[PDB]
Amino acid sequence: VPKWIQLNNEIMIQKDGKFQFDKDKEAVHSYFVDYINQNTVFFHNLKEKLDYLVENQYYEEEFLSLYSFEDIKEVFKTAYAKKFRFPSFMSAFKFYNDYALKTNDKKKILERYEDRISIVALFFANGDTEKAKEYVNLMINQEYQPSTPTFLNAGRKRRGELVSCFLLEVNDSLNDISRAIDISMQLSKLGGGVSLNLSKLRAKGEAIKDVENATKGVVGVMKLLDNAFRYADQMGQRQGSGAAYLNIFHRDINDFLDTKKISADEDVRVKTLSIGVVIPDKFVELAREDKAAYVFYPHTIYKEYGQHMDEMDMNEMYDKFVDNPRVKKEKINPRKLLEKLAMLRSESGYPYIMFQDNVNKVHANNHISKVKFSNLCSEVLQASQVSSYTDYDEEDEIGLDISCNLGSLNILNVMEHKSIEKTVKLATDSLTHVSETTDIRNAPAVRRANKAMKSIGLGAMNLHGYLAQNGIAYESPEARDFANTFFMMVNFYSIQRSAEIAKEKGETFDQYEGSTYATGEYFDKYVSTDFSPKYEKIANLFEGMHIPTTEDWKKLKAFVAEHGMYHSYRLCIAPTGSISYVQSSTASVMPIMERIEERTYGNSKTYYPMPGLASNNWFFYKEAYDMDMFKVVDMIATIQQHIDQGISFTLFLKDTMTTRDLNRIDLYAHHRGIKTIYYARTK
Amino acid sequence: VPKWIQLNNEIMIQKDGKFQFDKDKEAVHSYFVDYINQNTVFFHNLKEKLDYLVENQYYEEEFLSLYSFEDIKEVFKTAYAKKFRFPSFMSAFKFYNDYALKTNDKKKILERYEDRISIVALFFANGDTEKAKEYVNLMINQEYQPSTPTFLNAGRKRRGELVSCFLLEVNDSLNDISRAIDISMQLSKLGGGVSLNLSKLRAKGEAIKDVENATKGVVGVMKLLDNAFRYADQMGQRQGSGAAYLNIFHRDINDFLDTKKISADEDVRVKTLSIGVVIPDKFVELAREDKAAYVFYPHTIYKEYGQHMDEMDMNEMYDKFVDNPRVKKEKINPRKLLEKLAMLRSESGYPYIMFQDNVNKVHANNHISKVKFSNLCSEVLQASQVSSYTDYDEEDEIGLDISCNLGSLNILNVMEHKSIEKTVKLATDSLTHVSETTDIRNAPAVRRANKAMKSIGLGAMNLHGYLAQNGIAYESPEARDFANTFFMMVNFYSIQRSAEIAKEKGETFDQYEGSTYATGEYFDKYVSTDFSPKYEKIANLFEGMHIPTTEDWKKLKAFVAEHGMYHSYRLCIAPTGSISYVQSSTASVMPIMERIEERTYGNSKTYYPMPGLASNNWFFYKEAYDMDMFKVVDMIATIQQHIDQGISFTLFLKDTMTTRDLNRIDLYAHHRGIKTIYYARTK
Amino acid sequence: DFTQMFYNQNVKQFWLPEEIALNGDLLTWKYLGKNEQDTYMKVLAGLTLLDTEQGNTGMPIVAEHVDGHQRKAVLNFMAMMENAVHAKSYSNIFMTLAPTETINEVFEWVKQNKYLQKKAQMIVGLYKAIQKDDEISLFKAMVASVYLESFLFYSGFYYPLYFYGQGKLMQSGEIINLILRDEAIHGVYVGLLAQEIYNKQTEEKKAELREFAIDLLNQLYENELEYTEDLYDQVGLSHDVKKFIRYNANKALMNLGFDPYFEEEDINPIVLNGLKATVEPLKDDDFYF
Amino acid sequence: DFTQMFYNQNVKQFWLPEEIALNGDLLTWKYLGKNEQDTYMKVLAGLTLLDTEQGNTGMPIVAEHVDGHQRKAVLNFMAMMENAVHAKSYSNIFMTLAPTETINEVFEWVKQNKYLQKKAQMIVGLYKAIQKDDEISLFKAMVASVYLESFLFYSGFYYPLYFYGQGKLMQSGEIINLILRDEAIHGVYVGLLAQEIYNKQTEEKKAELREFAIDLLNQLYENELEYTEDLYDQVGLSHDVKKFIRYNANKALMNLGFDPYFEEEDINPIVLNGLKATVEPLKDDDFYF
Ligand SMILES: Cc1cn([C@H]2C[C@H](O)[C@@H](COP(=O)(O)OP(=O)(O)OP(=O)(O)O)O2)c(=O)[nH]c1=O
Ligand SMILES: Nc1nc2c(ncn2[C@H]2C[C@H](O)[C@@H](COP(=O)(O)OP(=O)(O)O)O2)c(=O)[nH]1
Ligand SMILES: Nc1nc2c(ncn2[C@H]2C[C@H](O)[C@@H](COP(=O)(O)OP(=O)(O)O)O2)c(=O)[nH]1
Ligand SMILES: [Mg+2]
Ligand SMILES: [Mg+2]
Ligand SMILES: [Mn+2]
Ligand SMILES: [Mn+2]
Ligand SMILES: [Mn+2]
Ligand SMILES: [Mn+2]
């Protein structure tokens, strides 16, 4: 047995009635001095290291050529001057197993944490030495963490894309379905997760050029996409991950949901394709009144009205669709559909739930389009325009397919350094650079929307870690007060940085003038309502850091109206799965699942206590399954009001609660303004 | 039970020790008089019928506008002047159930046999009244039958394509694989069978741009294509049919064959994808000497030589591949692979066997490319060039994908009319017209090859019917003598008509100058060997008909050298499945499977004696299973020497036949020059 | 060619009675007339009684005489579903809708009923007549089993499906639909085992087995018509139930590889809404001619 | 007093081998010596044979003779587990770890192994000797079944447990632990049925039944010793396994209500270390907060 995992297993050996949490420090120390320093390739000087990495196709020469070697040396000194030490064995293990650069035979270790951070910072700065040092300080202090694609691939030659979330709109044609399959395989080949909207596709039993009952529905396209994602699996190390989204008023909604039933046949069930359901407020209203709802055939609506069903407002056109004889509709029970959704989430965790009117009542770019679906992680909520891929000889009408670069603030380290403003602005700059350097040459709509919208996603993590290490319960009103103030400040500084970038570059995102930022309606609750902490305990947490007031928000509103905004979307809170270990942080803004997390890697068993877990804060680290999901919904809705995109909201369910409890949680989330619900995790 | 169904069922009722074959005339008469004349929409004049058909979106106004109504009336007069009568109930039933035009609700009948033939002839002539009358005489005499797509769809507004066989090359790239899936779905949507060459795709466990062992091989593409064909199911009318071809020296050949095993896993098995194996002479030579053979990874060969493995001559390149250390291979047993092929054909009828060197030793367009694979029916053998489908922004390099137009001479009717020359030339003209009028907007390589090659397929049928009705056994040497003479004449007149078309249009097919037609090497066996019948009985069959001599072939060679050749390919003997009933003919050049065909339509069972079956010729209608497959191979090889493309050669096996017997049949077919083997049908 | 595939489909259809909450059926049950409640009870008891024979005798006796480890395993799984899942499910439905005394009386009535007894004893008689190492007697029992699984249950299934298609008794209707889905696959599987025996027979023996199957079908069908009128005339449904019996008789015949006996009919839309030759090596000289 | 709780326990323990991914054992398997792999394959093959006969014959035949629909439902469920779940799981393990030829060879080896044939002959002979309405022949078969469940499997179980306890072959080991968890409850249940029959007898008859049980145990034990030596001598573990089978023999006797027969011994501590949601309808008040 390895010495470091033997030391790491001494955490669970209870001495004097307490877990030996200090063993993890010894565990990581032994891990380093017995595996990492031995397996680390060391060069005489940094110049030899960089030459070796560039020559052997490990790094990219173009980005390293913008700095003189003295500047690169200064950046590396800045990284190593911090003398960063991993606080736990899991942090270092995850870094050196997932993100640290290794030789071509996966034998030795080329990059330390400081080397990777310095390379990512030099990639972000794009020739600026001082900006590179600022990025080094930001990441070595672990105030900001670039997403897994960016952190893993920044500055590497044989790399995937820095963006891993893509959203595709599929038009109701065979050419568009073929192009969707092709683009899905191309993006899965790059390593990204692809989400597809299947609402514009006509339902099963619709006509294909005046021959009736000819269309196979969205389930045939679902099978096509599932096999396309199985094919493009990148060695199978990380198999192709796709998501399909369907509006709840699509006729194929029941067959769409039946693809996830355990008793589904092999000719229907999809395995590699996650599913999400988009629910307008009309469906919730119909289920609330116990009235008879109707699902519609999309092609009939398109023929009758000239627009797709999901491109229309269901809360204003549902009655017109029902009364229209030329529209084909099928009678359903909305409460039965809700119960089926709850049962499917209990048994499989699917579908993802998107509350469409919750997304679009606060959506800033409804002039471009309404948000019709989310991503594979169920937190990207941006306007999309469907493309019209025509025959080979004809020109294609390229729409807007969503993609944003992810990045997380570490709430604990940002709050410790009293650096919300600087961290948010530097992270915004880094995400803007990642957006600018991304060029997808096989997804035309993704490329066009990346150039036009310039959307970024700046998330946060370690919310529960910060609260538990500060003696605040996750369900407590003080926690929601802190989240309100913190994320209002993050929104303020992200909007300020976007406006400053627009002023400097002299350009805004496409169709900015129609957005709510340009009209000033976005800032109504910010110029009217003060978001300063209401509790003295929370107010001391922000001591030494200026909290923008209503006057500051009015000044920012004037600044945005006079200079514009560079990013259509700025903030989205992703799950942040594996980078949470490296940053020694709790995953996303969701509460922790286990206080001490037990994992098996190969034939070795190791335990990961939550960051900062001890006996003085053991009960503040309440597990997500033991807490009220209504209070978690309250917390996420408090955070969501300052986030322009969505939040990956996992529901943590006990075995005792029925499908009625899951439905009640979903309805309370819809009532409280929750935009999306990610997973129904059951213990 | 219908009266005609009862009358047709009285054939099996044996009266005086003989079948009541005359009951089928009563059966068809009752069928007509009781159902067809009742359900046939009648109009006061032909003008009213034509106006109703064009205005109600049944016909195309474009081709009918090319004639004055007087010319169309005279064409219809010519069709009805023959007073054509269906000899059997099954002929009329098949026509009026598969090809006759019906109302949009499929309740009444708009088209009789004469109306369908007149419309097809008017579409063929393209404005020529005398040519239309000639086509009417050719088809109402049932000397020439256009293929099911052409016969069914010609002159129809809501029609599929007139071509149903397509052959696609798939390049070793994700862009090309996605484009192949798209084109396969587009062509299956049109109702055409699609054949895909998978030999260029790199095998399983190959490197993808420095990531070794990352390719799923040809089986992942096979699953993608199977799901693509399942989705593109011809508007839910007829199941989507596709074929995949792999070289026997491809590394994935065993995985390719395992997709057809009855015990195949659901993640390996393909359902709607037929498989064909391409076998060079090198494999047969290795199996003959029992030397252990090697299957090669195609990407290693492409990297080492810059050419695809299937683009190179395995006879000269096999030793170089084996001795090359940079070419990856694994040992196989060629005899074990042959036994596996025979076992698979016994169990499921798959794969098709294409003898690569048998095709290419007589191929007239080896300069353009070698023939690497066949179609879904194993008779189309043409040169193909793989397309390089690049990224979306870049320009694609369009190659040549095979698609030929099918037509069948009725050997019995052509022989009784003494009109081999006239029928062959008119059929060539009609196939040329179908080729010119075909434009496919989503298969650029198919369209380019149709425009450039101008290849057609003129088949033959009713060989066994003609022989049995003339007192000649199918396995007899006299039958092979007749086949030799008849198909030599067909080849002579097809070459003459092609050269005449080239002279008239002043253009040949693309890259004709490199063909064996241009150099005269094609005509060597025709200017050196006499193909007149060697039997007095066979020579009497051709009485009143000039059999081309050696001097005639020399004159044709001079004419082709002077004026060129319009069609790269002219003759291919397709199975001719359903059009054989309408023509009262035995299917293709194959012998009959059963003397009397027992089939069930709806809830009523039907009986179909072979055309011309009686007491006097009962034993000349020997069933195919009772025949010696060696003699059938001899017959097909006699025909194959005059057919530039292949022949759909079905093996008819008894249950007592072993794997060794099937292997012996395959090896004798290879020895005798058979190009392709279609099916292993076991009784 | 088929046992592993059926194994997969069977085990992936596994379910338990507890999964469906039954109490909410009382909200529609209370609104049915006496004749509707009476017919439902009688139909339910009919299904229960027949399914018990299949669990205690039909499936285990076939599993005993069929050769092959994998077939015995699939057959064991099917027997388990009858005894452990279906039987408990029928009991649960009864206990929810009727008090103990009413259940006992309905079972007393249906136990004495002439048409239910006739078919139950005809089927059981064929199971009892199977002889060791006699594939003819096994085939006859398999035919009886297919007729029960794919045909005889359906005069009963009609009513729960009829309610289920109208939005009435939805919880018990869901249970019945799961049961019916199991019986469908049971019928198809046993049908394939019967065809295997049938295909091993001479032409004269085949004709004799066909006559047996058709004769048996006729006897059962004529009794089903009487059974149907006895239960469904009081609720006015017999005409439509008869169409459903014939449609399912045709499915049972097709399971046994036989032609349909009855003309095709449309079914009540409410019920619809509810619903290797020989491997030989190449020994050289086969490559030379 | 017990069948219902056994019914509930059995159905709540339901599992399929496909729930456990086995590719994780590939490396620890590759790393074992040829002797170790040979013993492991053979051990699981011996287990497969026992479960094949317990599923095909033992459990169904006992089910046939035991009275009461609930008792029959438990026994039918246990039978299904034997051949549809347990016996099949071993093939999942074999198909992952071993090439087809090694799999073919080990199944040929079970057919010709004299100890495995002897134990099957003895156990199945007793199953097939059961006479209808003869409780003594039934008791004898139930003793045989308890000895199969609680004693005979254990010469086989030792080795997967021995590896599991060292952190080796842990996915295969997880399957085996699930199988063992099932057999433990199967042995207790059949033991309770056997005790029911035993308790009906005179003191004289009881004395004879104890003689039968002890004579049978000793005969099986002596054969198992030779089997154990044959398999384990090449891996050096025969003495350790022998201690384990004696331990489990005592558990089998206890399941039958008899005193332990072998003296207690220290077992290898490694081996000791080797050891839908409810649907509720939505209310109107659920939509307001
Ligand atoms: C061709 C084809 C289409 N479809 C479905 C998927 C598409 O969403 C939908 C549109 O197909 P299209 O490619 O748009 O077919 P079309 O343009 O000829 O028909 P229309 O005039 O009605 O637009 O039909 C199938 O389900 N199966 C098929 O084989
Ligand atoms: N020598 C050396 N330095 C490395 C390596 N990887 C990262 N570094 C960092 C450590 C220092 O902060 C910085 C400069 O190291 P150096 O080139 O040895 O310079 P110096 O120590 O002579 O000033 O580079 C490495 O492999 N070797
Ligand atoms: N009248 C009529 N003729 C039809 C129809 N379908 C095909 N025909 C053919 C029959 C004749 O050969 C030809 C001309 O028919 P017509 O218009 O009645 O001609 P005429 O005999 O009055 O000059 O058209 C049809 O529906 N009606
Ligand atoms: Mg369209
Ligand atoms: Mg490439
Ligand atoms: Mn049942
Ligand atoms: Mn059943
Ligand atoms: Mn067992
Ligand atoms: Mn057991």
SS percent in chain A: helix, strand, coil, step 5 = 45, 15, 40
Contact residues on chain C for A263, CB-CB shorter than 8 A: 12-13, 15
Whether C248 is covered by a domain: the verdict is yes
Cβ contact A251:A219 at 8 Å: no
The reply to whether C285 touches chain B by the CB within 8 Å rule is no
Residue B27: what are its φ and ψ, rounded to 5°?
-65, -45
Instruction: List alpha helices for B513-549, DSSP H.
Output: 516-519, 524-528, 536-541
Local structure of A225: helix, strand or coil: helix
Cβ pair B228:A224 closer than 8 A: yes
DSSP 8-state symbol, A625: G
Ligand found nearest the CA of A207:
1
Cβ pair A659:D280 closer than 8 A: yes
Task: State how far Cα B353 lies from the chain centre.
Answer: 15
Q: Give strand pairing partners of A407.
A: A146, A458
Which of C280, C283, C285, C289 to substitute to test the interface with B, most B CBs within 10 Å?
C280
In angstroms, the CA B410 to CA D47 distance is 67
B274 marked ligand binding residue? no
Residue in B45, B74, B103 to alter for ligand 3 test, most ligand atoms within 8 A of Cβ = B45
E strand or H helix at B166: strand B165-169
Cβ neighbours, 10 Å, residue D70: 15
Give Cα separations from B331 to B259, B296, B297, B305, B328 (angstroms): 21, 9, 12, 21, 10
In angstroms, the CA B319 to CA A210 distance is 58
Chains B and D touch (3+ CB pairs under 8 A): no
Task: State how far Cα A146 lies from the chain centre.
Answer: 12
Name residues contacting ligand 3 (CB within 6 A): B 42-43, 45-46, 49, 73, 76-77, 80, 115
Own/partner long-range contacts of B219-223 (Cβ < 8 Å, ≥24 apart):
B219/B252, B219/B255, B219/B256, B219/B259, B219/B268, B220/A230, B220/A231, B221/A231, B221/B170, B221/B177, B221/B180, B222/B198, B222/B256, B222/B259, B222/B270, B222/B273, B223/A227, B223/A230, B223/A231, B223/B267, B223/B270
Whether C200 is covered by a domain: the verdict is yes
Contact residues on chain D for C69, CB-CB shorter than 8 A: 52, 56, 83, 87
DSSP string, chain D: --HHHHHHHHHHT---GGGS--GGGHHHHHTS-HHHHHHHHHHHHHHHHHHHHIIIIIHHHHHHHS-SHHHHHHHHHHHHIIIIIIHHHHHHHHHHHS-HHHHHHHHHHHHH-HHHHHHHHHHHHHHHT--TT-HHHHHHHHHHHHHIIIIITHHHHHHHHHHHTTT-SHHHHHHHHHHHHHHHHHHHHHHHHHHHHHTTS-HHHHHHHHHHHHHHHHHHHHHHHHHHHHHHGGGT-HHHHHHHHHHHHHHHHHHTT----S---PPPHHHHHT--PPP-PPPGGGG--
In angstroms, the CA C141 to CA C130 distance is 7
Residue closest to A160 by CA, chosen among A187, A182, A184: A187
In angstroms, the CA A222 to CA A215 distance is 13
Contact residues on chain D for C11, CB-CB shorter than 8 A: 16, 84
DSSP 8-state symbol, C150: I
DSSP 8-state symbol, C285: S
Q: How many CA atoms lie within 13 A of C207 on its CB side?
A: 3
Cβ contact B270:B365 at 8 Å: no
Whether D287 is covered by a domain: the verdict is no
Which of D29, D166, D282 to substitute to test the interface with A, most A CBs within 10 Å?
D282
Whether D12 is covered by a domain: the verdict is yes
The total domain count for chain D is: 1
Whether C48 is covered by a domain: the verdict is yes
Q: Both tokens of residue D235?
A: 């891996």
Task: Among C60, C69, C74, select the one facing D60 at the smallest CB separation.
Answer: C60
Report the interhelical angle of C34-53 vs C87-97 (nearest 10°): 160
DSSP 8-state symbol, A259: T
Annotated catalytic residue B377: yes
Residue closest to B443 by CA, chosen among B165, B238, B81, B133: B165
Cβ contact C191:C257 at 8 Å: yes
Cβ contact B587:B379 at 8 Å: no
Give Cα separations from A125 to A69, A419, B264, D242 (angstroms): 15, 19, 55, 71
Local structure of B315: helix, strand or coil: helix
In angstroms, the CA C108 to CA C104 distance is 6
Cβ neighbours, 10 Å, residue A668: 18
Contact residues on chain A for C12, CB-CB shorter than 8 A: 262-263
Local structure of B238: helix, strand or coil: coil
Residues contacting C246, CB < 8 A, separation 6+: C221, C262, C265
Cβ contact B454:B460 at 8 Å: no
Contact residues on chain A for C13, CB-CB shorter than 8 A: 263
Q: Give strand pairing partners of A607.
A: A598
Which of D166, D278, D283, D285 to substitute to test the interface with A, most A CBs within 10 Å?
D278
Q: Both tokens of residue A95?
A: 């870094």
Whether C289 is covered by a domain: the verdict is no
The reply to whether D284 touches chain A by the CB within 8 Å rule is yes
Ligand found nearest the CA of A74:
2
**D: neighbours with 3+ CB pairs under 8 Å?**
A, C
The reply to whether D280 touches chain A by the CB within 8 Å rule is yes
Residues contacting C248, CB < 8 A, separation 6+: C150, C151, C154
Annotated catalytic residue A404: no
Cβ contact A382:A568 at 8 Å: yes
Catalytic residue chosen out of the listed positions D40, D90, D189, D198: D90
Residue closest to D244 by CA, chosen among D107, D43, D56, D34: D43
A576 marked ligand binding residue? yes
Cβ contact C289:B670 at 8 Å: no
Annotated catalytic residue A375: yes
Q: Both tokens of residue D101?
A: 């030829």
Task: Among C55, C56, C73, select the one facing D55 at the smallest CB separation.
Answer: C73
Ligand found nearest the CA of A299:
1
Contact residues on chain C for B663, CB-CB shorter than 8 A: 282, 286
In angstroms, the CA D22 to CA D172 distance is 7
Cβ contact B246:B237 at 8 Å: no
Cβ pair C69:D79 closer than 8 A: no
E strand or H helix at B355: strand B352-355
Map A549-584 to HEC letters.
CHHHHHHHHHHHHHHCCCCCCCCCECCCCCHHHHCC
Q: Both tokens of residue B470?
A: 């003339």
Sign of CA dihedral C230, C232, C236, C238: negative
**A: neighbours with 3+ CB pairs under 8 Å?**
B, C, D
Residues contacting A592, CB < 8 A, separation 6+: A464, A465, A468, A586, A610, A621, A622, A623, A624
DSSP 8-state symbol, B211: B
Catalytic residue chosen out of the listed positions C90, C147, C158, C164: C90
Cβ contact B154:B406 at 8 Å: no
Cβ contact B4:B37 at 8 Å: no
Give Cα separations from B148 to A331, B437, C248 (angstroms): 42, 16, 37
Task: Among B290, B603, B660, select the one facing C280 at the smallest CB separation.
Answer: B660
Give the position of tokens 């471009």: A368
Whether D7 is covered by a domain: the verdict is yes
Cβ contact B596:B109 at 8 Å: no
What phi-psi label fits residue D32: left (phi over 0), alpha (psi between -120 and 50 degrees) or beta? beta
Cβ contact B360:B370 at 8 Å: yes
In angstroms, the CA C164 to CA C172 distance is 8
Cβ contact C263:C243 at 8 Å: no
In angstroms, the CA B48 to CA B70 distance is 13
Question: Strand B405-410's sheet: what is its strand order?
Answer: B144-146, B405-410, B456-461
In angstroms, the CA A458 to CA A572 distance is 6
CA of A295 to the centre of ligand 1 (A): 20
Residues contacting C207, CB < 8 A, separation 6+: none
Catalytic residue chosen out of the listed positions A171, A360, A375, A405: A375
Sign of CA dihedral A46, A48, A49, A54: positive
- Cα nearest neighbour of D286 on chain A: A664
DSSP 8-state symbol, B195: E
Domains of chain B: 3-142 (no CATH), 143-280+334-683 (3.20.70.20), 281-333 (no CATH)
Map B590-603 to HEC letters.
CCCCCCEEEEEECC
Closest residue CA from atom 16 of ligand 2: A45
Domain ranges, residue D123: 1-275
Ligand 3 atom at shortest distance from the alpha carbon of B77: 12
Residues with CB under 5 A from ligand 7 (ion): C 183, 186
Q: CATH number, domain at D174?
A: 1.10.620.20
